Amino acid sequence: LRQLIAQSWHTDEIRKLRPSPVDEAKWGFAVVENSLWQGVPNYLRELNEQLEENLGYKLPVEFVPVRFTSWMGGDRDGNPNVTADITRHVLLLSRWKATDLFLKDIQVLVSELSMVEATPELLALVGEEGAAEPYRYLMKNLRSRLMATQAWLEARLKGEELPKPEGLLTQNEELWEPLYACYQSLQACGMGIIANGDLLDTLRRVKCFGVPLVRIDIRQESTRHTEALGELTRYLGIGDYESWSEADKQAFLIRELNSKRPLLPRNWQPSAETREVLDTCQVIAEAPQGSIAAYVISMAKTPSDVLAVHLLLKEAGIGFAMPVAPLFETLDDLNNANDVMTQLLNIDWYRGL
Amino acid sequence: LRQLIAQSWHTDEIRKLRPSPVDEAKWGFAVVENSLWQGVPNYLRELNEQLEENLGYKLPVEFVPVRFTSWMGGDRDGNPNVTADITRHVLLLSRWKATDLFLKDIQVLVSELSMVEATPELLALVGEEGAAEPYRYLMKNLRSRLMATQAWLEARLKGEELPKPEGLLTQNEELWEPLYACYQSLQACGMGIIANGDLLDTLRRVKCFGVPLVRIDIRQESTRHTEALGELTRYLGIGDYESWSEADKQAFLIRELNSKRPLLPRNWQPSAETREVLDTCQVIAEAPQGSIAAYVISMAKTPSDVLAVHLLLKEAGIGFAMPVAPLFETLDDLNNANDVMTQLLNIDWYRGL
Amino acid sequence: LRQLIAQSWHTDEIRKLRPSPVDEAKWGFAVVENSLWQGVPNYLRELNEQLEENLGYKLPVEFVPVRFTSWMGGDRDGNPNVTADITRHVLLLSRWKATDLFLKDIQVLVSELSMVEATPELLALVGEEGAAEPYRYLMKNLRSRLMATQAWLEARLKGEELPKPEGLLTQNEELWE
């Protein structure tokens, strides 16, 4: 205890400079491995135990009701330092850290799960060369898989381009598949005490953290979206979005959201601010599905604020549903919140989105 | 002579299979190094000598009135085997062969051009570490430059992606600059006999062949362009290009050629044929400027046939002027040729293009 | 002819420093490729032709009565500059140059020797995958063999140690076979 205290007194490095988004992101990673990594599985362990003892049943293994997300590297509201590049960087860095922590988890299983008796099905996934040690087999392919992506990430993180490997991991499903199989087997062949041990923990960390480690939200103010769209419309000669009434904006947005003809020019040199709005959306469309959880709109006031973002995400190439949430942070906006949503829900197209 | 004849009698491998465009392209390369490489400089040498002897003056060194182009890998008229990929491949292969032949040329200069006396200006380009052997210096940087691009090409030719090097050569100007400098110097410091020797030859091979070795033309029939455009318009709900009168087509094309809003959908799954028409244009836009000499349109009949291609090249990202030539290959078309061109030249926009 | 003469007049670099044994060795290599390489085979060609025409018989193919040796890098008599290292270096350099010149020779054969009909025995050495082009086959293994040793030599010549390859050539018998 005396050394620990002494260390805190002599090892104190006050920041000389303002922290960057990447530093704040790393700070979040430290919280994950030093507390959340063990904390979530322990809470889930106790939750079930209390459910069965009082209610008479546990929750299915596949059910993990907890998820952790972050704003570090995603929230760019009034923060010019959070650029599309920083976000892109932070996204790779999270994936990298995820392989670091999962690697440790897998190393354990590769040592403990040495049992030989396994169910027929599992015996198939491994087949020949994997009948000697079925479980130990799958876990080693997972470790090779992980070291592969980690290796790639470290390269991309240094600014080095390189053809992505074969076993590159990008979806939690890829981690859950083999681990869940081992679990299923051990449970059947009479080894539940083992399955519900370290395996159950890693399995839960997959659905709570997964490949991205901690998903992130993107948040930007409605104004920036409006200004970028107005610049886009003026360039095309369509008119000035910034000066159209709410009705005209809605008309324009619904028309272009249903349009199959692109709107965004291929070779365009927009202003700095507008470009950031456009690049950020490009990062969202490129990042593996499951990396970004939601897109929050600060200062949301009208229905068009919500539709605007859906349009930009569309012209970005987004290939899936992206939760877009309005942020009402004003007395007036909060009072109108309900009207704004009522109007949105009355737009049949928006309901189907 | 007896061995040579005997060789022809025992070394005869009749093609078992039909030749691919890449083979025909290689055949063209064989003509270049075994005859054109020496032939052009010798003809240019004699041309000047006769000009001065009879007219009393030679043509400026920078004036090389001869250029060689090829259709192998470019002409896809009625030839399904010439795909966008083959063309892309043949383009790299030509660049590669160009470095092979220029490498030999440069090796010579690196040996012969050892003189020390050089003009002040040249002494600058080399500066320190290059004053000992100014000429021998520049030529070695050119050789390093060449081996660099050649190395890269060999990688791309094998289907291996890799960050392009620094001294990558893509423009004849990059080869002409240093060589012409050496020439200028040697001429001033009283060494014209040397300058107008092997140097003058390589200098001429630069403007006649250059980096691409032999430029190529792309040729496709008007029909394919029409069918791809009709598919594009029907997909967008604009209408059916294939069924519009000549007037309507011209109207549509002139409108979209002046438009700043893209027309080509980002994520589109068109038919095989239409896709080939679109990819070919993408190859033209990606290839270094100076790789493709002209785009020929077989079966040209109307003004819209010419404008159609200009539109596709525009939606491809072409960043420069591309000679588009109509091909009148019919009695009727030849009789209308003049009217068709008169109408084209009456379109002010087309005149400025 | 005028350019050739002019070149000799402007391209003259008198040695500033005394030549090293390695330079004298390279000079010898220049004599080999620019004159001896063609000269020996031409002399042997004429020798046989005259033997048969006057005596009535040619010498067996395996009989090559000419050999060239050198002292550059070997003679250290009263020459302190020829050390054990220089000799070791010159030895690698010769081997290297040998692969360079033989490489050119082999490239030719890989192009001309395309005939298909071959004797049973030869068909064996090539076997499967080599029946299509028996001769063209062996010559390509020889080229791979050569580029292998050449690659190794270039490494050793730069002072870089490295496990010697598999098809490393060290005996004329390996080329002759």
Curated annotation (Swiss-Prot), chain C:
Function comment: Forms oxaloacetate, a four-carbon dicarboxylic acid source for the tricarboxylic acid cycle.
Q: Which domain of life is it from?
A: Bacteria
Q: What is this protein called?
A: Phosphoenolpyruvate carboxylase
- Quaternary context: Homotetramer.
Q: Which family does it belong to?
A: Belongs to the PEPCase type 1 family.
